[PDB]
């Protein structure tokens, strides 16, 4: 299937971090304001007043080599729903921009085929949980940062993901991709803790 991408980091508890969204062993981990994993999967979202649960900084993208990366995304899969895509993994092959031909395997942690890649500095959008979390991230509310050097001021836990956008990802601007669902690699499940019960029904990367 083909899809289109965007990028974001709003610090919000991801939607697949709630219990009972999908048949999984446990939901996606959320974290406190200090980037520490929470044990209460029902913790109130930091994108609501008085909330305490935010997106974990280890749910960020990284390069394996110049041709292949791992990461996470908020998704909308045509014909499906959260019960089907929460914690599912997808192998993306980019089909436009400076990353055309490169592959990235992502795990859906939140919510046409559209993937909004988790990328610190991609923009906090309408929700802006980052302001309550730690006082705000650099960047335009919509669009986030524009230059690599802006990552230098990010919270240290969010820097690796921030730089990835400029380094591996070549500052690609909303690239298109083709994708296929795949069993989640251990490296992704290690970060979210969330493994789908149906993951034996899909091919390996």
CSV table of C-alpha atoms in Angstrom, one decimal:
chain,number,residue,atom,x,y,z
A,1,UNK,CA,0.0,0.0,0.0
A,2,UNK,CA,1.0,3.7,-0.5
A,3,UNK,CA,0.8,6.4,2.1
A,4,UNK,CA,1.9,9.9,2.9
A,5,UNK,CA,3.9,11.1,5.9
A,6,UNK,CA,4.2,14.0,8.3
A,7,UNK,CA,6.3,14.5,11.4
A,8,UNK,CA,5.4,15.5,15.0
A,9,UNK,CA,6.4,15.5,18.6
A,10,UNK,CA,3.7,16.9,20.9
A,11,UNK,CA,4.8,15.1,24.1
A,12,UNK,CA,1.2,13.6,24.5
A,13,UNK,CA,0.5,10.2,25.9
A,14,UNK,CA,0.2,8.2,22.7
A,15,UNK,CA,-3.2,6.7,22.1
A,16,UNK,CA,-2.0,3.1,22.1
A,17,UNK,CA,-0.7,3.8,25.6
A,18,UNK,CA,-4.2,3.2,27.0
A,19,UNK,CA,-5.4,-0.2,28.0
A,20,UNK,CA,-8.0,-2.1,26.0
A,21,UNK,CA,-7.1,-0.5,22.6
A,22,UNK,CA,-5.9,-3.7,21.0
A,23,UNK,CA,-5.1,-7.3,21.8
A,24,UNK,CA,-1.6,-6.8,23.2
A,25,UNK,CA,0.4,-8.0,26.2
A,26,UNK,CA,0.6,-4.5,27.6
A,27,UNK,CA,0.0,-1.0,26.1
A,28,UNK,CA,2.6,1.4,24.9
A,29,UNK,CA,4.6,2.8,27.9
A,30,UNK,CA,4.0,6.4,28.8
A,31,UNK,CA,6.4,8.5,31.0
A,32,UNK,CA,6.4,11.2,33.6
A,33,UNK,CA,7.5,14.7,32.9
A,34,UNK,CA,11.1,13.5,33.7
A,35,UNK,CA,11.1,10.8,30.9
A,36,UNK,CA,10.8,7.9,33.4
A,37,UNK,CA,8.4,5.1,32.4
A,38,UNK,CA,5.0,5.0,34.3
A,39,UNK,CA,3.5,1.8,35.7
A,40,UNK,CA,0.0,3.1,35.6
A,41,UNK,CA,-1.3,2.7,32.0
A,42,UNK,CA,-4.4,4.6,32.9
A,43,UNK,CA,-2.5,7.7,34.0
A,44,UNK,CA,-4.1,10.9,32.9
A,45,UNK,CA,-2.6,12.4,29.7
A,46,UNK,CA,-0.3,15.4,30.0
A,47,UNK,CA,-2.2,16.9,27.1
A,48,UNK,CA,-5.1,17.5,29.4
A,49,UNK,CA,-5.2,19.8,32.5
A,50,UNK,CA,-3.6,18.1,35.6
A,51,UNK,CA,-2.3,15.2,33.6
A,52,UNK,CA,0.9,13.4,34.3
A,53,UNK,CA,1.6,11.0,31.4
A,54,UNK,CA,3.7,12.0,28.4
A,55,UNK,CA,5.4,10.4,25.4
A,56,UNK,CA,8.6,8.6,26.3
A,57,UNK,CA,11.8,9.9,24.8
A,58,UNK,CA,13.0,6.5,23.8
A,59,UNK,CA,10.1,6.2,21.4
A,60,UNK,CA,12.2,8.1,18.8
A,61,UNK,CA,13.8,7.2,15.5
A,62,UNK,CA,17.4,6.0,15.0
A,63,UNK,CA,19.6,4.9,12.2
A,64,UNK,CA,20.9,1.4,11.8
A,65,UNK,CA,22.8,2.3,8.6
A,66,UNK,CA,22.4,4.9,5.8
A,67,UNK,CA,19.8,2.7,4.1
A,68,UNK,CA,17.7,1.6,7.2
A,69,UNK,CA,16.2,3.2,10.2
A,70,UNK,CA,13.8,2.3,13.1
A,71,UNK,CA,11.1,4.4,14.6
A,72,UNK,CA,7.5,5.1,15.6
A,73,UNK,CA,4.4,6.8,14.3
A,74,UNK,CA,0.9,8.0,14.8
A,75,UNK,CA,-1.1,6.2,12.0
A,76,UNK,CA,-4.4,6.1,10.2
A,77,UNK,CA,-4.6,2.9,8.1
A,78,UNK,CA,-7.4,2.9,5.5
A,79,UNK,CA,-10.0,0.2,6.3
A,80,UNK,CA,-8.7,-0.5,9.7
A,81,UNK,CA,-8.8,0.9,13.3
A,82,UNK,CA,-6.8,1.1,16.5
A,83,UNK,CA,-7.7,-2.5,17.4
A,84,UNK,CA,-5.8,-3.4,14.2
A,85,UNK,CA,-2.9,-0.9,14.1
A,86,UNK,CA,-2.0,-0.2,17.7
A,87,UNK,CA,1.4,-1.6,18.3
A,88,UNK,CA,1.6,-3.0,14.7
A,89,UNK,CA,4.7,-2.6,12.8
A,90,UNK,CA,5.1,-1.5,9.2
A,91,UNK,CA,8.1,-1.5,6.9
A,92,UNK,CA,8.1,1.8,5.0
A,93,UNK,CA,10.0,2.3,1.7
A,94,UNK,CA,10.2,6.0,1.0
A,95,UNK,CA,9.2,7.0,-2.5
A,96,UNK,CA,9.9,10.7,-2.6
A,97,UNK,CA,12.5,13.2,-1.4
A,98,UNK,CA,16.1,12.8,-0.4
A,99,UNK,CA,15.2,9.5,1.3
A,100,UNK,CA,13.7,7.8,-1.7
A,101,UNK,CA,14.6,4.1,-1.6
A,102,UNK,CA,15.6,4.0,2.1
A,103,UNK,CA,13.6,1.8,4.4
A,104,UNK,CA,12.3,2.4,7.9
A,105,UNK,CA,10.5,-0.1,10.1
A,106,UNK,CA,8.1,1.7,12.5
A,107,UNK,CA,5.7,0.7,15.2
A,108,UNK,CA,2.4,2.5,15.4
A,109,UNK,CA,1.9,3.9,18.9
A,110,UNK,CA,-0.9,6.4,18.2
A,111,UNK,CA,-3.5,7.7,15.9
A,112,UNK,CA,-6.3,7.4,4.3
A,113,UNK,CA,-2.9,5.7,4.9
A,114,UNK,CA,-1.0,8.4,6.8
A,115,UNK,CA,1.9,8.0,9.1
A,116,UNK,CA,3.0,11.0,11.3
A,117,UNK,CA,6.5,10.0,12.2
A,118,UNK,CA,7.6,10.6,15.8
A,119,UNK,CA,10.4,13.2,15.5
A,120,UNK,CA,11.3,15.6,18.2
A,121,UNK,CA,11.2,19.1,16.7
A,122,UNK,CA,8.8,18.0,13.9
A,123,UNK,CA,6.2,20.3,15.6
A,124,UNK,CA,3.9,20.1,18.7
A,125,UNK,CA,0.8,21.0,16.8
A,126,UNK,CA,-2.6,21.8,18.5
A,127,UNK,CA,-2.1,19.7,21.6
A,128,UNK,CA,1.3,20.9,22.9
A,129,UNK,CA,2.0,18.7,25.8
A,130,UNK,CA,5.6,19.8,25.7
A,131,UNK,CA,4.8,23.1,27.4
A,132,UNK,CA,3.3,21.4,30.5
A,133,UNK,CA,6.0,18.7,30.4
A,134,UNK,CA,9.1,20.8,30.6
A,135,UNK,CA,8.2,24.4,29.5
A,136,UNK,CA,8.1,23.9,25.8
A,137,UNK,CA,10.2,22.8,22.9
A,138,UNK,CA,11.9,25.1,20.4
A,139,UNK,CA,10.2,25.5,17.0
A,140,UNK,CA,7.1,26.9,15.5
A,141,UNK,CA,4.0,25.3,17.1
A,142,UNK,CA,3.1,24.2,13.6
A,143,UNK,CA,6.1,23.0,11.6
A,144,UNK,CA,8.5,22.7,14.5
A,145,UNK,CA,12.2,23.6,14.0
A,146,UNK,CA,13.9,24.3,10.6
A,147,UNK,CA,17.6,23.9,11.3
A,148,UNK,CA,19.7,21.2,12.8
A,149,UNK,CA,21.4,23.6,15.3
A,150,UNK,CA,18.0,24.1,17.0
A,151,UNK,CA,18.3,20.6,18.3
A,152,UNK,CA,21.1,21.7,20.5
A,153,UNK,CA,18.7,23.3,23.0
A,154,UNK,CA,16.4,20.2,23.2
A,155,UNK,CA,16.1,18.1,26.4
A,156,UNK,CA,19.1,15.7,26.1
A,157,UNK,CA,16.8,12.6,25.9
A,158,UNK,CA,15.1,14.1,22.9
A,159,UNK,CA,18.3,15.1,21.0
A,160,UNK,CA,19.1,11.8,19.3
A,161,UNK,CA,15.7,11.8,17.7
A,162,UNK,CA,15.9,15.5,16.8
A,163,UNK,CA,19.2,15.2,15.0
A,164,UNK,CA,18.0,12.0,13.1
A,165,UNK,CA,15.7,14.2,11.1
A,166,UNK,CA,18.6,16.1,9.6
A,167,UNK,CA,21.2,13.3,9.5
A,168,UNK,CA,19.6,10.0,8.4
A,169,UNK,CA,16.4,11.5,7.2
A,170,UNK,CA,18.1,14.3,5.3
A,171,UNK,CA,15.5,16.9,6.4
A,172,UNK,CA,13.0,15.2,4.1
A,173,UNK,CA,9.8,17.1,3.9
A,174,UNK,CA,6.8,14.8,4.3
A,175,UNK,CA,7.9,12.0,2.0
A,176,UNK,CA,5.6,9.5,0.5
A,177,UNK,CA,6.2,5.8,1.0
A,178,UNK,CA,4.9,2.4,0.3
A,179,UNK,CA,4.4,0.1,3.3
A,180,UNK,CA,3.6,-3.5,4.4
A,181,UNK,CA,2.7,-4.8,7.8
A,182,UNK,CA,5.5,-6.9,9.4
A,183,UNK,CA,6.0,-8.7,12.7
A,184,UNK,CA,7.6,-6.1,15.1
A,185,UNK,CA,11.3,-6.3,15.5
A,186,UNK,CA,12.5,-6.8,19.1
A,187,UNK,CA,14.2,-3.4,19.0
A,188,UNK,CA,10.8,-1.6,18.7
A,189,UNK,CA,9.0,-3.7,21.2
A,190,UNK,CA,11.9,-3.1,23.6
A,191,UNK,CA,11.0,0.6,23.6
A,192,UNK,CA,7.2,0.4,23.8
A,193,UNK,CA,6.8,-2.8,25.7
A,194,UNK,CA,3.8,-3.5,23.4
A,195,UNK,CA,3.5,-6.7,21.4
A,196,UNK,CA,0.4,-7.6,19.4
A,197,UNK,CA,-1.1,-11.0,19.9
A,198,UNK,CA,-1.5,-11.3,16.1
A,199,UNK,CA,2.2,-10.6,15.3
A,200,UNK,CA,2.7,-14.2,14.2
A,201,UNK,CA,0.4,-13.5,11.3
A,202,UNK,CA,2.8,-11.2,9.3
A,203,UNK,CA,6.1,-11.5,7.6
A,204,UNK,CA,9.4,-10.5,9.0
A,205,UNK,CA,11.3,-7.4,7.8
